[PDB]
């Protein structure tokens, strides 16, 4: 009864019926669901018995400042009482001292000598799924740090251990003996559609990641037909013994008089290490020839897709499996060590610290033992020079790898590239990744979920790792779910992504229900946005807003749109929907602006979400995640550029949520220079500054001009490094604190060479409204240079991250040309003295371009 309800609920939540998985009758799919159900149910059982503090670390992981004395006012209360107390504490005090102080006031008011010790409690942030615990001082917590900048007072609740336990309780659930050349039979093509004035060619390649194992073989030219017949042998120049484990056979069917039609790839060995034999029907994917990186599973739409039949020949009378790790380590155990001169050792040091020539690859390979012992972080370059088309060479390389020491997270993220398709090399990358903290993992999760699209099989090390970490952290679980869920309309990933979400759901029944409440809210938002789109092409904005409001006031709407966790942040609770405050934006897609309030949270419960359907939001999220990382990298070096890292989350097909930043308007709106306002100006250059002055009276203007200066320097650098163009007054926002930030991200990474942009209006604010202010202007250039030089020292981080994102399917992130842009913007080739001089030329060039509006 409950088993059937859970399954149908999973089916609705994931957006694919579980019955569809069974109907494939695929043993690989059937082993994944059994082995991952068990693995996720064990994680669940482990969780239902965690300690109470241990339960907070799962459900409410700490939100700490990248870094993690002074008077501070905090307001504390208890769960079963409306009565609060306001204490004067210090930012250097640990939450525990606040707790002991909170109980002291309760001891007098209630006159009893309180049995409770501070240790017995946790401090909940008012009307939020956020907690303050652990031995970190108050300023170290993101909520107190945010509170300290906005002047506003922290509002906390005392939560007893027994109450947290009550929450845990209610949330309960031999190959090497076959030297003949690898060949195949190309039998026939089916349902192909092309010009009859042309001929059909079949191109095949044997790959190990991005590298060829041998040269490509083309079929004979056959006349264009819907059912073309070949019945021909395609011999490759590689022996069946030399075929690596991660060898993938790639096909590109096309038309010639080069006209791309379709493509298809398959792994030569199955998920049980067996070399494949017998007839194979490859349901081809459409082109725009040979695509190594493309998925190794067939096209689901079997009725429309082209279906090339091939025939893997019987290389032996019995089945053939890839030799086990014991046979590999035995063959690779044999060889000669690196005995070379100081001169070749000096050249080896020069190339390993530094793309290399053939002879330079020959020295990396001969000196592989010196690489293992004296250059372990050079592992990726050694894996690159290895000949993956020679069984002896792979075995030597694998033998070194099993004895290879663990590498930093930085080196491990590089090893996840499609360049390293070897499962033992990938298992190795995951072993060096396990030391990632939850915060580091959250930072790179977007890229790790993309790496899943490179994976040759369902049951892989990266899936178990992502699953295990997601079941031990509710925030990780949340974002993993939404990154998978959002790509369910993509037929190439839907089976993989649907299977991972089903596994997770088996491990968190309670969270499956929480996320369905989010899914139901997004369901109603799409129907409401659809209404608005139709209504805005028929009536006036006041009329459409009122009708949107009437629709929202319905029982079904009021209930679905209310009392939920935010998909943008599970800490944020969207309680009561303020219908009167809701509206829509006037852009093509008519985005909805949805407001919420919460009495339990006060001012902190006054939140909003923007719902946008019709436009792709994956590039906006990636841009924002990159900027957020910059802010993290800067803060770690003690540079706080006053950034606004707001939420952006794609949820479905051209659908997603953007976080509302209140007390912010666009440069364009402020610059309208409307009459009967506190910001009305004598000169349009005054407007932004008058607005700033109106919002920040007295001594407050100085801090606002400084928030402006700091954020501006950060965004000038962020948009320059990331090449974010189409920047105008309508997509630049200013907060009432003076903080500047960017919205609506179309183009990024040139698509060319977007220059460093300095705008006179912002230079006018930095210079405090004065024509000349070298003091303030050069303090600004210093912030810019400092920011730029910090990013450069983390150049490989961005490069390793952007390389993993190539799997994403973003048209503006599809080749080496895009990654080159980063290398160029960060002047990754030059020394810091050289890069700084290059940055100062582009900065001065940008000031000279800003001086066009200064002159006029
Ligand atoms: C409801 C009314 C009283 N408002 C409407 C909004 N404007 C300001 C405004 C105009 N555009 C945005 C905005 C726009 C977007 C946005 C919109 C479209 C694509 C995007 N990609 C990344 C951000 C983004 C996100 C935002 N978060 N917080 C504010 C925004 O805010 C103030 C008055």
Complete DSSP assignment for 399-434: HHHHTPPP--HHHHHHTTSTT---HHHHHHHHHTTT
Q: What are phi and psi of 369, to 5 degrees?
A: -70, -35
Cα(326) to centroid(ligand 1), Å: 59
SS3 string, 634-697, reads HHCCCCCCCCCCCCEEEEECCEEEEECCCCEEEHHHHCCCCCCCCCCCCCCCCHHHHHHHHHCC
Cα(535) to centroid(ligand 1), Å: 21
Give the side-chain half-sphere CA count within 13 A for 814.
7
Return the closest-CA partner of residue 812 out of 752, 856, 772, 854: 752
Q: Is the CB of 593 under 6 A from ligand 1?
A: yes
The torsion defined by the Cα of 461, 467, 469 and 470, in degrees rounded to 10, comes to 160
d(Cα 441, Cα 433) in Å, to the nearest integer?
9
Q: Whose CA is nearest to atom 30 of ligand 1?
A: 660
d(Cα 765, Cα 358) in Å, to the nearest integer?
56
Q: Is the CB of 621 under 6 A from ligand 1?
A: no
Q: What are phi and psi of 546, to 5 degrees?
A: -65, -40
Helix (H) or strand (E) holding 350: helix 342-353
Query: What SS3 state is found at 853?
Result: helix
Q: Whose CA is nearest to atom 21 of ligand 1?
A: 744
Strands 155-160 and 71-78: parallel
List, in order, residues 6 or more apart from 38 with CB less than 8 Å away. Answer: none
- Residue 224 contacts residue 174 (beta carbons within 8 Å): no
Q: Is the CB of 661 under 6 A from ligand 1?
A: yes
Number of CB atoms found within 10 A of residue 301's CB:
10
Residue with tokens 């020949």: 313
As a whole number of angstroms, the longest Cα–Cα distance in the chain is 97
The pair of structure tokens assigned to 505 is 């759901």
Q: How far, CA to CA in Å, does 744 sit from each of 283, 609, 624, 656, 730? A: 38, 15, 10, 13, 9
End-to-end alpha-carbon separation of the chain, Å? 76
- Residue 440 contacts residue 827 (beta carbons within 8 Å): no
d(Cα 595, Cα 601) in Å, to the nearest integer?
14
- Residue 532 contacts residue 541 (beta carbons within 8 Å): no
Q: Whose CA is nearest to atom 20 of ligand 1?
A: 744
- Residue 370 contacts residue 344 (beta carbons within 8 Å): no
- Residue 418 contacts residue 397 (beta carbons within 8 Å): no
d(Cα 264, Cα 248) in Å, to the nearest integer?
10
Handedness of CA 205, 211, 213, 215 (dihedral sign): positive
d(Cα 627, Cα 622) in Å, to the nearest integer?
9
Q: Is the CB of 667 under 6 A from ligand 1?
A: no
d(Cα 776, Cα 769) in Å, to the nearest integer?
11
Q: How far from the centroid of its chain's Cα atoms is residue 5's Cα?
A: 32
Query: What SS3 state is found at 731?
Result: coil
Q: How far, CA to CA in Å, does 189 sit from each of 116, 184, 593, 816? A: 77, 15, 51, 33
- Which atom of ligand 1 sits closest to the CA of residue 612? 18
SS3 string, 480-521, reads HHHHHHCCCCCCCCHHHHHHHHHHHHHHCHHHHHHHHHHHHH
**Domain 178-323, CATH number (from 3.40.630.30, 3.50.50.60, 2.60.40.150, 3.40.50.1220):** 2.60.40.150
Question: Residue 198: left if φ>0, alpha if ψ -120 to 50, beta else—which one?
Answer: beta
Q: Is the CB of 610 under 6 A from ligand 1?
A: yes
Query: What SS3 state is found at 707?
Result: helix
- Residue 707 contacts residue 642 (beta carbons within 8 Å): yes
Residue with tokens 């939540």: 13
d(Cα 305, Cα 190) in Å, to the nearest integer?
9
Return the closest-CA partner of residue 236 out of 272, 271, 208: 208
Number of CB atoms found within 10 A of residue 696's CB:
18
d(Cα 255, Cα 201) in Å, to the nearest integer?
6
Return the closest-CA partner of residue 375 out of 353, 342, 399: 353
The pair of structure tokens assigned to 207 is 């790959």
Return the closest-CA partner of residue 749 out of 776, 712, 719, 707: 719
Q: Whose CA is nearest to atom 23 of ligand 1?
A: 743
Q: Is the CB of 665 under 6 A from ligand 1?
A: yes
The pair of structure tokens assigned to 291 is 């695509």
Experimental method: X-ray
Give the side-chain half-sphere CA count within 13 A for 623.
28
Helix (H) or strand (E) holding 830: none
Cα(727) to centroid(ligand 1), Å: 15
Q: Is the CB of 745 under 6 A from ligand 1?
A: yes
Domain 1-48+324-508: state its class: mainly alpha
Number of CB atoms found within 10 A of residue 547's CB:
14
List, in order, residues 6 or more apart from 142 with CB less than 8 Å away. Answer: 63, 64, 65
d(Cα 623, Cα 731) in Å, to the nearest integer?
14
Helix (H) or strand (E) holding 46: helix 27-47
Question: Ligand 1 pocket: which of 744, 745, 746 to mutate (most atoms <8 Å of CB)?
Answer: 744
d(Cα 478, Cα 567) in Å, to the nearest integer?
8
DSSP state of 269: B
Query: What SS3 state is found at 5?
Result: helix
Return the closest-CA partner of residue 438 out of 474, 408, 482, 406: 474
The pair of structure tokens assigned to 184 is 């195949």
Tell me the chain's radius of gyration from C-alpha atoms: 30
d(Cα 620, Cα 625) in Å, to the nearest integer?
9
DSSP state of 754: P
Q: Which residues pair with 593 in a beta bridge?
A: 583, 610
Q: What are phi and psi of 228, to 5 degrees?
A: -70, 140
- Domain layout of the chain by residue ranges: 1-48+324-508, 49-174, 178-323, 509-660, 663-856
Q: Whose CA is nearest to atom 4 of ligand 1?
A: 665
Cα(352) to centroid(ligand 1), Å: 48
DSSP state of 99: H
Question: Ligand 1 pocket: which of 626, 722, 733 to mutate (most atoms <8 Å of CB)?
Answer: 733
d(Cα 568, Cα 648) in Å, to the nearest integer?
7
Environment class of 63 (CB within 10 Å of its CB; exposed 0-12, middle 13-18, buried 19+): buried
Q: Is the CB of 583 under 6 A from ligand 1?
A: yes
Cα(660) to centroid(ligand 1), Å: 7
List, in order, residues 6 or more apart from 579 with CB less than 8 Å away. Answer: 549, 552, 553
d(Cα 646, Cα 628) in Å, to the nearest integer?
9
Query: What SS3 state is found at 310?
Result: strand
The pair of structure tokens assigned to 147 is 């509170």
Q: Is the CB of 422 under 6 A from ligand 1?
A: no
- Residue 697 contacts residue 759 (beta carbons within 8 Å): no
- Residue 505 contacts residue 13 (beta carbons within 8 Å): yes
Strands 285-286 and 155-160: unpaired
Return the closest-CA partner of residue 619 out of 380, 813, 357: 813
Cα(568) to centroid(ligand 1), Å: 15
Cα(574) to centroid(ligand 1), Å: 18
- Residue 713 contacts residue 785 (beta carbons within 8 Å): no
d(Cα 250, Cα 491) in Å, to the nearest integer?
19
Residue with tokens 């789109």: 533
Q: Is the CB of 666 under 6 A from ligand 1?
A: yes
Number of CB atoms found within 10 A of residue 398's CB:
21
DSSP state of 384: H
Question: Residue 614: left if φ>0, alpha if ψ -120 to 50, beta else—which one?
Answer: left
Helix (H) or strand (E) holding 466: helix 461-470
d(Cα 691, Cα 711) in Å, to the nearest integer?
17
Cα(731) to centroid(ligand 1), Å: 9
Q: Is the CB of 744 under 6 A from ligand 1?
A: yes
Q: Whose CA is nearest to atom 9 of ligand 1?
A: 665
Q: What are phi and psi of 513, to 5 degrees?
A: -70, -40
SS3 string, 274-305, reads EECCEEEEEECEECCCCCCCCCCCCCCCCCCC
d(Cα 127, Cα 130) in Å, to the nearest integer?
8
The pair of structure tokens assigned to 244 is 């690596």
d(Cα 90, Cα 203) in Å, to the nearest integer?
71
The pair of structure tokens assigned to 831 is 């020394």
Complete DSSP assignment for 785-854: HHHHHHHHTTHHHHHHHHHHGGGG-BTTBSSHHHHHHHHHHTTTTS-HHHHHHHHHHHHHHHHHHHHHHH
Helix (H) or strand (E) holding 576: strand 576-577
- Residue 135 contacts residue 62 (beta carbons within 8 Å): no
- Which atom of ligand 1 sits closest to the CA of residue 581? 1
The pair of structure tokens assigned to 843 is 């900065």
Cα(684) to centroid(ligand 1), Å: 23
- Residue 56 contacts residue 122 (beta carbons within 8 Å): yes
d(Cα 450, Cα 469) in Å, to the nearest integer?
17
The pair of structure tokens assigned to 577 is 């929907």
Number of CB atoms found within 10 A of residue 739's CB:
23
The pair of structure tokens assigned to 214 is 């041998």
d(Cα 510, Cα 507) in Å, to the nearest integer?
9
DSSP state of 183: E
Per-residue burial over 138-169, b = 16 or more CB atoms within 10 Å of its CB, e = otherwise: bbbbbbbbebeeeeeebbbbbbbbeebeeebe
How many helices (H) and strands (E) would you count in the chain?
31, 27
d(Cα 223, Cα 107) in Å, to the nearest integer?
92
Resolution in A: 2.4
Q: Whose CA is nearest to atom 6 of ligand 1?
A: 665
d(Cα 721, Cα 128) in Å, to the nearest integer?
35
Number of CB atoms found within 10 A of residue 393's CB:
18
For the domain covering 49-174, report its CATH number: 3.10.20.90
d(Cα 39, Cα 459) in Å, to the nearest integer?
12
SS3 string, 756-802, reads CCCCHHHHHHHCCCCCCCHHHHHHHHHHHHHHHHHHHCCHHHHHHHH
- Which atom of ligand 1 sits closest to the CA of residue 665? 8
d(Cα 115, Cα 107) in Å, to the nearest integer?
10
Domain 663-856: state its class: mainly alpha
Q: Is the CB of 85 under 6 A from ligand 1?
A: no
Return the closest-CA partner of residue 421 out of 390, 455, 446: 455
Question: Ligand 1 pocket: which of 654, 658, 691, 740 to mutate (most atoms <8 Å of CB)?
Answer: 658
d(Cα 98, Cα 87) in Å, to the nearest integer?
8
Complete DSSP assignment for 207-251: EETTEESS--EE---EE--SS-EEEEEEEEEEETTS--TT-EEEE
Q: How far from the centroid of its chain's Cα atoms is residue 409's Cα?
A: 16
- Residue 134 contacts residue 64 (beta carbons within 8 Å): no
d(Cα 7, Cα 806) in Å, to the nearest integer?
34
509-660: CATH topology = 3.30.1010
The pair of structure tokens assigned to 71 is 């008077």
Cα(657) to centroid(ligand 1), Å: 11
Residue with tokens 């719902």: 611
DSSP state of 323: P
Query: What SS3 state is found at 194?
Result: coil
- Which atom of ligand 1 sits closest to the CA of residue 585? 5
Q: Is the CB of 582 under 6 A from ligand 1?
A: no
Q: What are phi and psi of 722, to 5 degrees?
A: -85, 0
- Residue 540 contacts residue 577 (beta carbons within 8 Å): no
The pair of structure tokens assigned to 533 is 């789109």
Intrachain domains 178-323 and 509-660 with the same fold:
no
d(Cα 291, Cα 268) in Å, to the nearest integer?
16
The pair of structure tokens assigned to 750 is 């040139």
Q: Whose CA is nearest to atom 31 of ligand 1?
A: 665
- Residue 91 contacts residue 72 (beta carbons within 8 Å): yes
Return the closest-CA partner of residue 198 out of 230, 176, 222: 222
Strands 121-125 and 131-132: antiparallel
- Which atom of ligand 1 sits closest to the CA of residue 731? 11
Per-residue burial over 679-692, b = 16 or more CB atoms within 10 Å of its CB, e = otherwise: bebeeeebbbbbbb
Q: Which residues pair with 583 in a beta bridge?
A: 593
Cα(666) to centroid(ligand 1), Å: 8
Environment class of 511 (CB within 10 Å of its CB; exposed 0-12, middle 13-18, buried 19+): buried
Return the closest-CA partner of residue 418 out of 73, 115, 699, 808: 808
Q: Which residues pair with 810 in a beta bridge?
A: 813
Return the closest-CA partner of residue 459 out of 449, 469, 467, 470: 467
d(Cα 236, Cα 219) in Å, to the nearest integer?
12
d(Cα 110, Cα 31) in Å, to the nearest integer?
60
């Amino acid at each position: 009864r409950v088993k059937k309800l859970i399954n149908s609920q999973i089916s609705l939540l994931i957006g694919k019926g579980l019955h569809e998985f069974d109907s494939l009758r695929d043993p690989e799919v059937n082993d994944f669901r059994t082995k991952m159900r068990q693995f996720c149910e064990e994680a669940a059982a482990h969780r239902q018995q965690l300690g109470w503090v241990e339960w907070l670390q799962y459900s409410f992981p700490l939100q700490l400042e990248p870094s993690a004395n002074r008077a501070l006012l905090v307001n504390v209360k208890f769960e079963g009482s409306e009565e609060s107390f306001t204490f004067q504490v210090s930012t250097k005090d640990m939450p525990l001292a606040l707790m002991a102080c909170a109980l002291r006031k309760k001891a007098t008011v209630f006159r009893q000598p309180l049995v409770e010790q501070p240790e017995e409690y946790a401090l909940q942030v008012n009307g939020r799924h956020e907690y303050l615990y652990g031995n970190y001082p108050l300023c170290h917590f993101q909520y107190i740090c945010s509170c300290l900048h906005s002047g506003l007072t922290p509002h906390l609740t005392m939560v007893h251990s027994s109450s947290i336990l009550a929450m845990r309780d209610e949330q309960s659930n031999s190959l090497w003996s076959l030297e003949q050349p690898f060949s195949i039979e190309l039998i026939e093509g089916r349902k192909v559609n092309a010009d009859e004035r042309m001929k059909l060619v079949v191109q095949a390649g044997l790959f190990h990641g991005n590298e060829m194992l041998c040269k490509t073989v083309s079929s004979s030219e056959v006349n264009v037909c819907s059912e073309p017949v070949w019945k021909q042998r395609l011999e490759f120049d590689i022996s069946v013994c030399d075929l690596p484990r991660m060898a993938r056979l790639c096909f590109a069917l096309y038309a010639v008089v080069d006209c791309p039609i379709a493509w298809a790839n398959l792994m030569l060995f199955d998920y049980k290490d067996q070399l494949k034999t017998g007839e194979r029907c490859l349901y081809m994917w459409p082109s725009v020839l040979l695509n190594p990186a493309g998925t190794v599973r067939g096209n689901p739409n079997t009725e429309s897709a082209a279906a090339l039949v091939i025939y893997l020949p019987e290389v032996a009378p019995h089945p053939v499996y890839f030799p086990a790790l014991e046979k590999i380590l035995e063959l690779g155990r044999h060889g000669e060590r690196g005995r070379i001169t100081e001169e070749e050792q000096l050249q080896l040091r020069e190339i390993l610290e530094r793309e290399l020539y053939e002879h330079e690859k020959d020295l990396v390979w001969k000196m592989r033992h010196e690489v293992q012992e004296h250059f372990p972080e050079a592992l990726a370059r050694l894996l690159l020079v290895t000949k993956w088309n020679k069984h002896e060479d792979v075995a030597q390389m694998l033998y070194l790898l099993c004895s290879w020491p663990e590498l930093p997270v930085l080196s491990a993220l590089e090893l996840l590239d499609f360049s390293f398709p070897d499962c033992y090399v990938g298992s190795f990358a995951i072993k060096s990744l396990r030391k990632l903290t939850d915060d580091e993992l959250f930072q790179y999760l977007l890229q790790l979920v993309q790496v899943l699209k490179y994976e040759s099989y369902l049951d892989c090390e990266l899936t178990k790792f992502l699953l295990g970490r997601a079941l031990a952290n509710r925030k990780i679980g949340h974002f993993l779910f939404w990154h998978l869920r959002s790509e369910m309309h993509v037929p190439s990933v839907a089976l993989r992504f649907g299977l991972i979400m089903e596994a997770y759901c088996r491990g968190s029944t309670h969270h499956m229900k929480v996320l369905m409440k989010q899914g139901e809210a997004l369901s109603k938002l799409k129907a409401l946005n659809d209404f608005v789109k139709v209504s805005s092409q028929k009536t006036t904005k006041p009329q459409t807003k009122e009708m949107m409001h009437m629709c929202m006031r319905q029982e079904t709407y009021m209930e679905a749109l209310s009392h939920l966790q935010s998909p943008l942040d599970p800490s944020t609770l969207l309680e009561e929907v303020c219908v009167e405050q809701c509206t829509f934006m006037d852009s093509k897609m008519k985005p909805l602006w949805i407001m919420y309030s919460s009495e339990e949270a006060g001012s902190a419960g006054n939140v909003g979400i923007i719902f946008k359907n019709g436009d792709d939001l994956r590039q906006d999220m990636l841009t924002l995640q990159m900027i957020q990382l910059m802010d993290v990298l800067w803060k770690q070096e003690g540079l706080d550029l006053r950034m606004t890292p707001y939420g952006c989350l794609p949820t479905g097909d051209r659908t997603g949520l953007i976080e509302v930043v209140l007390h912010s308007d666009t440069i364009a709106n402020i610059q309208l220079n409307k009459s009967n306002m506190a910001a009305t100006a004598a000169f349009n250059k005054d407007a932004l500054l008058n607005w700033l002055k109106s919002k920040n009276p007295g001594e407050a203007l100085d801090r606002a001009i400084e928030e402006f200066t700091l954020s501006c320097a950060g965004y000038c650098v962020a948009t320059y490094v990331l090449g974010i163009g189409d920047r105008h007054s309508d997509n630049i926002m200013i907060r009432e604190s003076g903080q500047l930030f960017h919205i609506d991200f179309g183009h990024f990474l040139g698509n060319e060479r977007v220059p460093f942009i300095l705008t006179y209006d912002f230079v006018h604010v930095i210079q405090q409204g004065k024509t000349n202010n070298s003091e303030k202007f050069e303090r600004f250039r210093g912030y810019c240079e400092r920011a730029y030089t910090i990013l450069r020292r983390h150049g490989l981080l961005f490069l390793h991250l952007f390389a993993l994102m190539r799997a994403a399917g973003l048209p503006e992130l599809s080749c080496s040309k895009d990654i080159q842009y980063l290398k160029d913007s960060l002047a990754l080739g030059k020394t810091e003295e050289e890069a700084l001089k290059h940055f100062r030329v582009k900065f001065n060039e940008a000031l000279r371009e800003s001086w066009k509006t200064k002159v006029n």
